[PDB]
Amino acid sequence: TGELFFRSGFGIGMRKDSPWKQNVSLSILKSHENGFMEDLDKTWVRYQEC
Amino acid sequence: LNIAVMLGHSHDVTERELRTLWGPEQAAGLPLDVNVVALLMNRTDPKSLITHVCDLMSGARIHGLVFGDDTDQEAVAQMLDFISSHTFVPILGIHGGASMIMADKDPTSTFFQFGASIQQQATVMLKIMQDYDWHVFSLVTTIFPGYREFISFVKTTVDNSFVGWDMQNVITLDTSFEDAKTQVQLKKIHSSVILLYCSKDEAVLILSEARSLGLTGYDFFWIVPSLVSGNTELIPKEFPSGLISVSYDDWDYSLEARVRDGIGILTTAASSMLEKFSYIPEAKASCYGQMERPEVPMHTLHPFMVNVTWDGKDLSFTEEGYQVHPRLVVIVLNKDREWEKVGKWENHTLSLRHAVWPRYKSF
Amino acid sequence: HFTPTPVSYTAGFYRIPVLGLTTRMSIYSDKSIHLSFLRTVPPYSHQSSVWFEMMRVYSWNHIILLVSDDHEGRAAQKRLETLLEERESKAEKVLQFDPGTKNVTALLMEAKELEARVIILSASEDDAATVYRAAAMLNMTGSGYVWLVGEREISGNALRYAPDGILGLQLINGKNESAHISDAVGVVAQAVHELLEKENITDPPRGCVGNTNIWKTGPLFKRVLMSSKYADGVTGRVEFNEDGDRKFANYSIMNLQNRKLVQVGIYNGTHVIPNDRKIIWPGGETEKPRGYQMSTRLKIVTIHQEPFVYVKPTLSDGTCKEEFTVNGDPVKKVICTGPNDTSPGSPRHTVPQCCYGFCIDLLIKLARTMNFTYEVHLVADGKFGTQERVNNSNKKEWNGMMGELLSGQADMIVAPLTINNERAQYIEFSKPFKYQGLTILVKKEIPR
Amino acid sequence: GCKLVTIGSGYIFATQKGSPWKRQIDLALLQFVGDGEMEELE
Amino acid sequence: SDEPDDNHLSIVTLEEAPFVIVEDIDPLTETCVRNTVPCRKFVKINNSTNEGMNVKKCCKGFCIDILKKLSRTVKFTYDLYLVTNGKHGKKVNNVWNGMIGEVVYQRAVMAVGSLTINEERSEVVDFSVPFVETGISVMVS
């Protein structure tokens, strides 16, 4: 019940001097654009009901 | 065995001999034959240091040191380094310039002082801001050597607080006799409680300016520590009501009470010597020779000054020689501008006050 | 140990200014206790600023700092950290020592764990010499292992066990003290003739008896000495810092080559002049090395959260099974080292346990597209971890997963972490997966 | 009248460089989402 | 008698309802409407004379309330104009138009919009935090 309280995103724990924020976030853009987010929606999220 | 005492001209010498006799007949009856040599002076003078110190080091290698002066020069306690390192004799600083702690205690220093313990100053100032809920600040220091320390104390101990103290920035007056730049930096005060860390003459200057700035109004408040109060015997003119200091003054104490307390501290350190040794590293002979080395093979009082308790009062000291259970007489100026007893910090370092919120009362 | 304390402080009863001629012990540079003591020769901590110039010539970001814990050492640490955080450059490690460390080998094995091979040194001579032994002993000297050395370690046996190609420092006109005599007498003479132009010149006390008063023109001595400029010195411009140490005294950077110092670096105070004598970097070639070498081995600790990480046991082999999804697809599974009794104050036994979920699929996608390997662990706490107080009631510290990244133990959090502003102040997220928020479990009521 | 039904019940498909402003803007947005003033605009 | 100041942020966005809703100058004894900022359009004279007269027009919406919040939090000055050439960004032999054309060619040093943070756009332009959730939806009767 209720709305999404504190609407944030689910990110990755990355140190500030980590140089690989870049291409990982590019792969994140690919996951949103090519539906790999939707692929995990199929493969882990959307199975069950009552 | 031997304790040397140099004082400001004050309560007298035979009085201190009677105080030593009463401390000897009081308690902890001393297999060591403790013998004390005391004098009254008024000097900040190093030839007096050479004469008195070297002539008492020639005489029977005196092992204890107590110093309560009627002085204010801070660097004297810093010049006790060469006694602590060219005699390696432990030093006790109760009043005077020996009280003025600005010497961060070296591993070669043998300092233990009844003076205004700096970390405890910062914590007690913050608990004063707690206990009447003065969350809104204004911070004015200067750039005397050692005030950037206090800037670090205020910043860290507010940032280590979940209270969320309302911060107005540390307004550091750069040099003296600016008198236009100081007024520009002190028109930047826009709150009630003004926290000062300065000298005494600069406090005269800042109060003379702030009586023109309108900041010495009597809904403002003024909590200024023992850097400016110092001798409560000296009450200069421009210092109004509601000035709040934190100092180890003999309002709650006397001279000879603290004398007997500190001699008892030395005798518990000497009893811990007689526990862990059965012999004592003697004091040096002369100021004019270095015979073999400074090898402290018999391990002087720095582990032995750790644990000291007297008469229900833990007179023990920290790693940097500050008081574990401190005294911290908190003293507020009133209408008559009289240094009077308000706060205490002897019970688990907790405040013991009069619940009088209003103190700036038309001086 | 007869570096000059006593004459200085016995002049420091009544706040009398003293100029240390060639002293480099930055204990004396501490204004808080050493009141009125200024120098014609700046100490090594000013040299700390000089190494930042190396940064802007040699383009570094990963820094190894080695400090024998001294008031000199901690003051140099303060200057280093200020000049880092002004340019936002970030050091990796500051390992700490006493003068006398010989079992450096544990801290050396810690030093084997970095991209950086940039070694900045501040300790005594024999400290350095034994380290040049133990690290060489590690092997730890190869091209990239660049030794950035204070001049105390350019004396004694620190000279005699160091390798070659080491960048060291030399202050120009440090030892010819006759030039210091000429410069200092010119400076103090015109400073006196600045003093005599002022007013209320207080009389200097004859006796050290009865003179119970500090100098009044003490700060006026200080205002003369800080504000006087002497461009016509033998050493260059005799003009001071806000430390009373000289600005723009000429610097040189040297290289033991067959243990023979070779001139490369020249500074007025800041102006970079590399000499034509090349820098053979102190292992291999003259190529500017990289303290940047990745491992593609990512320390991951995983929060016990299903379905994100289903934490199930392995087989009796310690290995995961052969299972399938609902789709009949074999699950990407991870052996995860983690405790059995996942509670505080319990016998915790690091067991391989199977892990299942979103983030494993994500990491193997990133293994394919990114070419990294992943070192996956379970949380001993089972918690995220916040800023809470440790005893003495002020120690605000990040706990849990935040405490694991901020201690160097974990290098990655691959877990559904909500974007937190305070966490982003320390540990910055990538682009987030799911734009979600908190919801509320309410019970299903029974029918009538 | 709102008989015009969009895609599902909210089923969403398709699920300057070097400025120092980025930290300021992003921590500010963490403050606003932590305070919900974007929800006030909503 | 200089006093240099670099606080003026050229923010040139599209008319995007309800993020950006542009009104005209109201004759309310001044040019001051309670929620508006004047925004200088380039109102072209003719087709042959394309001289865009910078006409101040009243401005409201989400993003202008957000820039008011940033003048209250980040506390700087923000220069509002409107986009005429292109809408967001067009790879016209990778010569960007619209928002991205104003960002890359630094016409709009700052650009807010209702900008979709695309992977192709993140290749070219950096982006902030998402502040409004979106994606692709389908509207039907």
PDB file of N, CA and C in Angstrom, chain C residues 11-75:
ATOM      1  N   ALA C  11      65.853  32.986  24.533  1.00  0.00           N
ATOM      2  CA  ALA C  11      65.500  34.295  23.995  1.00  0.00           C
ATOM      3  C   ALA C  11      63.984  34.470  23.923  1.00  0.00           C
ATOM      4  N   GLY C  12      63.232  33.368  24.003  1.00  0.00           N
ATOM      5  CA  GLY C  12      61.786  33.411  23.840  1.00  0.00           C
ATOM      6  C   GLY C  12      60.994  33.590  25.124  1.00  0.00           C
ATOM      7  N   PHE C  13      61.641  34.016  26.216  1.00  0.00           N
ATOM      8  CA  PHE C  13      60.889  34.484  27.379  1.00  0.00           C
ATOM      9  C   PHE C  13      60.051  35.708  27.045  1.00  0.00           C
ATOM     10  N   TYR C  14      60.687  36.754  26.518  1.00  0.00           N
ATOM     11  CA  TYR C  14      60.028  38.043  26.360  1.00  0.00           C
ATOM     12  C   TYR C  14      59.707  38.334  24.897  1.00  0.00           C
ATOM     13  N   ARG C  15      59.517  37.277  24.092  1.00  0.00           N
ATOM     14  CA  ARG C  15      59.077  37.346  22.689  1.00  0.00           C
ATOM     15  C   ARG C  15      60.060  38.134  21.822  1.00  0.00           C
ATOM     16  N   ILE C  16      61.281  37.616  21.737  1.00  0.00           N
ATOM     17  CA  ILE C  16      62.367  38.231  20.980  1.00  0.00           C
ATOM     18  C   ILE C  16      62.563  37.454  19.682  1.00  0.00           C
ATOM     19  N   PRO C  17      62.599  38.121  18.527  1.00  0.00           N
ATOM     20  CA  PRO C  17      62.697  37.393  17.253  1.00  0.00           C
ATOM     21  C   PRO C  17      64.090  36.818  17.026  1.00  0.00           C
ATOM     22  N   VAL C  18      64.130  35.552  16.606  1.00  0.00           N
ATOM     23  CA  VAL C  18      65.369  34.829  16.332  1.00  0.00           C
ATOM     24  C   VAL C  18      65.260  34.224  14.937  1.00  0.00           C
ATOM     25  N   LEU C  19      66.305  34.399  14.125  1.00  0.00           N
ATOM     26  CA  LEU C  19      66.376  33.800  12.794  1.00  0.00           C
ATOM     27  C   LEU C  19      67.314  32.597  12.825  1.00  0.00           C
ATOM     28  N   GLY C  20      66.741  31.408  12.674  1.00  0.00           N
ATOM     29  CA  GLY C  20      67.518  30.212  12.418  1.00  0.00           C
ATOM     30  C   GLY C  20      68.151  30.274  11.045  1.00  0.00           C
ATOM     31  N   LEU C  21      69.474  30.112  10.986  1.00  0.00           N
ATOM     32  CA  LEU C  21      70.196  30.346   9.739  1.00  0.00           C
ATOM     33  C   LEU C  21      69.943  29.237   8.726  1.00  0.00           C
ATOM     34  N   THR C  22      70.371  28.016   9.034  1.00  0.00           N
ATOM     35  CA  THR C  22      70.240  26.903   8.107  1.00  0.00           C
ATOM     36  C   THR C  22      69.406  25.753   8.643  1.00  0.00           C
ATOM     37  N   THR C  23      68.557  25.989   9.636  1.00  0.00           N
ATOM     38  CA  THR C  23      67.785  24.919  10.244  1.00  0.00           C
ATOM     39  C   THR C  23      66.651  24.467   9.327  1.00  0.00           C
ATOM     40  N   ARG C  24      66.434  23.150   9.309  1.00  0.00           N
ATOM     41  CA  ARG C  24      65.393  22.528   8.502  1.00  0.00           C
ATOM     42  C   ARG C  24      64.492  21.628   9.340  1.00  0.00           C
ATOM     43  N   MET C  25      64.606  21.697  10.662  1.00  0.00           N
ATOM     44  CA  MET C  25      63.754  20.944  11.575  1.00  0.00           C
ATOM     45  C   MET C  25      62.425  21.674  11.712  1.00  0.00           C
ATOM     46  N   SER C  26      61.363  21.173  11.082  1.00  0.00           N
ATOM     47  CA  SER C  26      60.137  21.968  11.033  1.00  0.00           C
ATOM     48  C   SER C  26      59.352  21.983  12.346  1.00  0.00           C
ATOM     49  N   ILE C  27      59.835  21.297  13.394  1.00  0.00           N
ATOM     50  CA  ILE C  27      59.406  21.553  14.772  1.00  0.00           C
ATOM     51  C   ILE C  27      59.490  23.034  15.099  1.00  0.00           C
ATOM     52  N   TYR C  28      60.607  23.670  14.746  1.00  0.00           N
ATOM     53  CA  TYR C  28      60.788  25.100  14.938  1.00  0.00           C
ATOM     54  C   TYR C  28      59.860  25.925  14.056  1.00  0.00           C
ATOM     55  N   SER C  29      59.329  25.347  12.972  1.00  0.00           N
ATOM     56  CA  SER C  29      58.424  26.104  12.116  1.00  0.00           C
ATOM     57  C   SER C  29      57.033  26.200  12.727  1.00  0.00           C
ATOM     58  N   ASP C  30      56.756  25.393  13.751  1.00  0.00           N
ATOM     59  CA  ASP C  30      55.467  25.426  14.424  1.00  0.00           C
ATOM     60  C   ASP C  30      55.329  26.721  15.209  1.00  0.00           C
ATOM     61  N   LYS C  31      54.519  27.644  14.686  1.00  0.00           N
ATOM     62  CA  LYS C  31      54.334  28.939  15.324  1.00  0.00           C
ATOM     63  C   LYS C  31      53.662  28.852  16.683  1.00  0.00           C
ATOM     64  N   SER C  32      52.864  27.804  16.921  1.00  0.00           N
ATOM     65  CA  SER C  32      52.040  27.701  18.123  1.00  0.00           C
ATOM     66  C   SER C  32      52.889  27.623  19.384  1.00  0.00           C
ATOM     67  N   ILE C  33      54.035  26.949  19.303  1.00  0.00           N
ATOM     68  CA  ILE C  33      54.881  26.843  20.484  1.00  0.00           C
ATOM     69  C   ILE C  33      56.178  27.617  20.275  1.00  0.00           C
ATOM     70  N   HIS C  34      56.828  27.440  19.121  1.00  0.00           N
ATOM     71  CA  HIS C  34      57.961  28.275  18.725  1.00  0.00           C
ATOM     72  C   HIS C  34      57.395  29.610  18.265  1.00  0.00           C
ATOM     73  N   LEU C  35      57.512  30.609  19.134  1.00  0.00           N
ATOM     74  CA  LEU C  35      56.724  31.826  18.998  1.00  0.00           C
ATOM     75  C   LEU C  35      57.264  32.721  17.888  1.00  0.00           C
ATOM     76  N   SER C  36      58.525  33.134  18.004  1.00  0.00           N
ATOM     77  CA  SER C  36      59.109  34.203  17.198  1.00  0.00           C
ATOM     78  C   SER C  36      60.388  33.731  16.517  1.00  0.00           C
ATOM     79  N   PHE C  37      60.307  32.617  15.797  1.00  0.00           N
ATOM     80  CA  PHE C  37      61.503  31.955  15.285  1.00  0.00           C
ATOM     81  C   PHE C  37      61.327  31.731  13.788  1.00  0.00           C
ATOM     82  N   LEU C  38      62.040  32.519  12.989  1.00  0.00           N
ATOM     83  CA  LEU C  38      61.880  32.501  11.544  1.00  0.00           C
ATOM     84  C   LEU C  38      63.203  32.114  10.896  1.00  0.00           C
ATOM     85  N   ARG C  39      63.137  31.635   9.657  1.00  0.00           N
ATOM     86  CA  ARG C  39      64.277  30.983   9.033  1.00  0.00           C
ATOM     87  C   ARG C  39      64.632  31.560   7.674  1.00  0.00           C
ATOM     88  N   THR C  40      65.932  31.644   7.428  1.00  0.00           N
ATOM     89  CA  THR C  40      66.446  31.863   6.089  1.00  0.00           C
ATOM     90  C   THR C  40      66.443  30.593   5.247  1.00  0.00           C
ATOM     91  N   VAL C  41      66.394  29.419   5.868  1.00  0.00           N
ATOM     92  CA  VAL C  41      66.295  28.167   5.121  1.00  0.00           C
ATOM     93  C   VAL C  41      64.990  27.467   5.480  1.00  0.00           C
ATOM     94  N   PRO C  42      64.088  27.266   4.523  1.00  0.00           N
ATOM     95  CA  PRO C  42      62.816  26.604   4.820  1.00  0.00           C
ATOM     96  C   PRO C  42      63.004  25.113   5.030  1.00  0.00           C
ATOM     97  N   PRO C  43      62.223  24.510   5.917  1.00  0.00           N
ATOM     98  CA  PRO C  43      62.312  23.068   6.158  1.00  0.00           C
ATOM     99  C   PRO C  43      61.691  22.237   5.042  1.00  0.00           C
ATOM    100  N   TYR C  44      61.599  20.937   5.319  1.00  0.00           N
ATOM    101  CA  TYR C  44      61.252  19.948   4.311  1.00  0.00           C
ATOM    102  C   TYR C  44      59.775  19.980   3.960  1.00  0.00           C
ATOM    103  N   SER C  45      58.938  20.494   4.863  1.00  0.00           N
ATOM    104  CA  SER C  45      57.498  20.495   4.639  1.00  0.00           C
ATOM    105  C   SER C  45      57.113  21.479   3.543  1.00  0.00           C
ATOM    106  N   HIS C  46      57.849  22.590   3.434  1.00  0.00           N
ATOM    107  CA  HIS C  46      57.743  23.434   2.248  1.00  0.00           C
ATOM    108  C   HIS C  46      58.111  22.666   0.993  1.00  0.00           C
ATOM    109  N   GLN C  47      59.110  21.784   1.104  1.00  0.00           N
ATOM    110  CA  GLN C  47      59.472  20.868   0.032  1.00  0.00           C
ATOM    111  C   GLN C  47      58.319  19.956  -0.364  1.00  0.00           C
ATOM    112  N   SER C  48      57.371  19.714   0.559  1.00  0.00           N
ATOM    113  CA  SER C  48      56.176  18.938   0.242  1.00  0.00           C
ATOM    114  C   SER C  48      55.408  19.586  -0.902  1.00  0.00           C
ATOM    115  N   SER C  49      55.288  20.924  -0.852  1.00  0.00           N
ATOM    116  CA  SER C  49      54.659  21.693  -1.923  1.00  0.00           C
ATOM    117  C   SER C  49      55.374  21.496  -3.249  1.00  0.00           C
ATOM    118  N   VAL C  50      56.706  21.349  -3.197  1.00  0.00           N
ATOM    119  CA  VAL C  50      57.524  21.145  -4.389  1.00  0.00           C
ATOM    120  C   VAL C  50      57.125  19.863  -5.104  1.00  0.00           C
ATOM    121  N   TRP C  51      56.722  18.826  -4.348  1.00  0.00           N
ATOM    122  CA  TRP C  51      56.366  17.565  -4.994  1.00  0.00           C
ATOM    123  C   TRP C  51      55.065  17.705  -5.780  1.00  0.00           C
ATOM    124  N   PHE C  52      54.212  18.662  -5.385  1.00  0.00           N
ATOM    125  CA  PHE C  52      52.994  18.934  -6.141  1.00  0.00           C
ATOM    126  C   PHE C  52      53.320  19.472  -7.521  1.00  0.00           C
ATOM    127  N   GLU C  53      54.432  20.204  -7.629  1.00  0.00           N
ATOM    128  CA  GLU C  53      54.911  20.648  -8.928  1.00  0.00           C
ATOM    129  C   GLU C  53      55.277  19.459  -9.800  1.00  0.00           C
ATOM    130  N   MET C  54      55.812  18.403  -9.181  1.00  0.00           N
ATOM    131  CA  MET C  54      56.066  17.149  -9.879  1.00  0.00           C
ATOM    132  C   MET C  54      54.784  16.589 -10.473  1.00  0.00           C
ATOM    133  N   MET C  55      53.687  16.689  -9.703  1.00  0.00           N
ATOM    134  CA  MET C  55      52.349  16.330 -10.159  1.00  0.00           C
ATOM    135  C   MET C  55      52.023  17.020 -11.469  1.00  0.00           C
ATOM    136  N   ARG C  56      52.176  18.351 -11.501  1.00  0.00           N
ATOM    137  CA  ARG C  56      51.726  19.072 -12.682  1.00  0.00           C
ATOM    138  C   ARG C  56      52.682  18.893 -13.849  1.00  0.00           C
ATOM    139  N   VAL C  57      53.845  18.279 -13.627  1.00  0.00           N
ATOM    140  CA  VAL C  57      54.736  18.031 -14.746  1.00  0.00           C
ATOM    141  C   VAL C  57      54.562  16.571 -15.135  1.00  0.00           C
ATOM    142  N   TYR C  58      54.236  15.716 -14.169  1.00  0.00           N
ATOM    143  CA  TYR C  58      54.318  14.289 -14.448  1.00  0.00           C
ATOM    144  C   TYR C  58      53.000  13.563 -14.251  1.00  0.00           C
ATOM    145  N   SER C  59      51.904  14.308 -14.057  1.00  0.00           N
ATOM    146  CA  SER C  59      50.518  13.881 -14.292  1.00  0.00           C
ATOM    147  C   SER C  59      50.146  12.649 -13.462  1.00  0.00           C
ATOM    148  N   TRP C  60      50.157  12.832 -12.152  1.00  0.00           N
ATOM    149  CA  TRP C  60      49.857  11.717 -11.275  1.00  0.00           C
ATOM    150  C   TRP C  60      48.485  11.896 -10.634  1.00  0.00           C
ATOM    151  N   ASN C  61      47.895  10.767 -10.244  1.00  0.00           N
ATOM    152  CA  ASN C  61      46.663  10.748  -9.461  1.00  0.00           C
ATOM    153  C   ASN C  61      46.659   9.726  -8.337  1.00  0.00           C
ATOM    154  N   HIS C  62      47.583   8.771  -8.318  1.00  0.00           N
ATOM    155  CA  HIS C  62      47.627   7.731  -7.302  1.00  0.00           C
ATOM    156  C   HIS C  62      48.949   7.835  -6.561  1.00  0.00           C
ATOM    157  N   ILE C  63      48.872   8.050  -5.249  1.00  0.00           N
ATOM    158  CA  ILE C  63      49.981   8.571  -4.459  1.00  0.00           C
ATOM    159  C   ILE C  63      50.247   7.645  -3.280  1.00  0.00           C
ATOM    160  N   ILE C  64      51.520   7.317  -3.064  1.00  0.00           N
ATOM    161  CA  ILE C  64      51.963   6.572  -1.893  1.00  0.00           C
ATOM    162  C   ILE C  64      52.735   7.518  -0.985  1.00  0.00           C
ATOM    163  N   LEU C  65      52.220   7.724   0.224  1.00  0.00           N
ATOM    164  CA  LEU C  65      52.826   8.598   1.220  1.00  0.00           C
ATOM    165  C   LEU C  65      53.324   7.768   2.390  1.00  0.00           C
ATOM    166  N   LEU C  66      54.551   8.040   2.832  1.00  0.00           N
ATOM    167  CA  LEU C  66      55.183   7.292   3.911  1.00  0.00           C
ATOM    168  C   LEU C  66      55.760   8.283   4.909  1.00  0.00           C
ATOM    169  N   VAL C  67      55.206   8.297   6.120  1.00  0.00           N
ATOM    170  CA  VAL C  67      55.517   9.315   7.118  1.00  0.00           C
ATOM    171  C   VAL C  67      55.889   8.643   8.427  1.00  0.00           C
ATOM    172  N   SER C  68      57.123   8.850   8.877  1.00  0.00           N
ATOM    173  CA  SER C  68      57.451   8.591  10.268  1.00  0.00           C
ATOM    174  C   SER C  68      56.731   9.619  11.124  1.00  0.00           C
ATOM    175  N   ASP C  69      55.951   9.132  12.091  1.00  0.00           N
ATOM    176  CA  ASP C  69      54.985   9.962  12.814  1.00  0.00           C
ATOM    177  C   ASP C  69      55.716  10.953  13.705  1.00  0.00           C
ATOM    178  N   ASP C  70      55.884  12.147  13.164  1.00  0.00           N
ATOM    179  CA  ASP C  70      56.608  13.233  13.784  1.00  0.00           C
ATOM    180  C   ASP C  70      55.719  14.469  13.744  1.00  0.00           C
ATOM    181  N   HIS C  71      55.984  15.425  14.640  1.00  0.00           N
ATOM    182  CA  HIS C  71      55.346  16.735  14.523  1.00  0.00           C
ATOM    183  C   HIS C  71      55.740  17.405  13.215  1.00  0.00           C
ATOM    184  N   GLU C  72      57.003  17.233  12.822  1.00  0.00           N
ATOM    185  CA  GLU C  72      57.440  17.532  11.465  1.00  0.00           C
ATOM    186  C   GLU C  72      56.643  16.731  10.449  1.00  0.00           C
ATOM    187  N   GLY C  73      56.509  15.427  10.697  1.00  0.00           N
ATOM    188  CA  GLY C  73      55.808  14.560   9.768  1.00  0.00           C
ATOM    189  C   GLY C  73      54.333  14.884   9.664  1.00  0.00           C
ATOM    190  N   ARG C  74      53.685  15.162  10.795  1.00  0.00           N
ATOM    191  CA  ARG C  74      52.260  15.467  10.760  1.00  0.00           C
ATOM    192  C   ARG C  74      51.997  16.869  10.222  1.00  0.00           C
ATOM    193  N   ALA C  75      52.918  17.812  10.452  1.00  0.00           N
ATOM    194  CA  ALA C  75      52.781  19.131   9.838  1.00  0.00           C
ATOM    195  C   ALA C  75      52.970  19.067   8.327  1.00  0.00           C
TER     196      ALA C  75
END
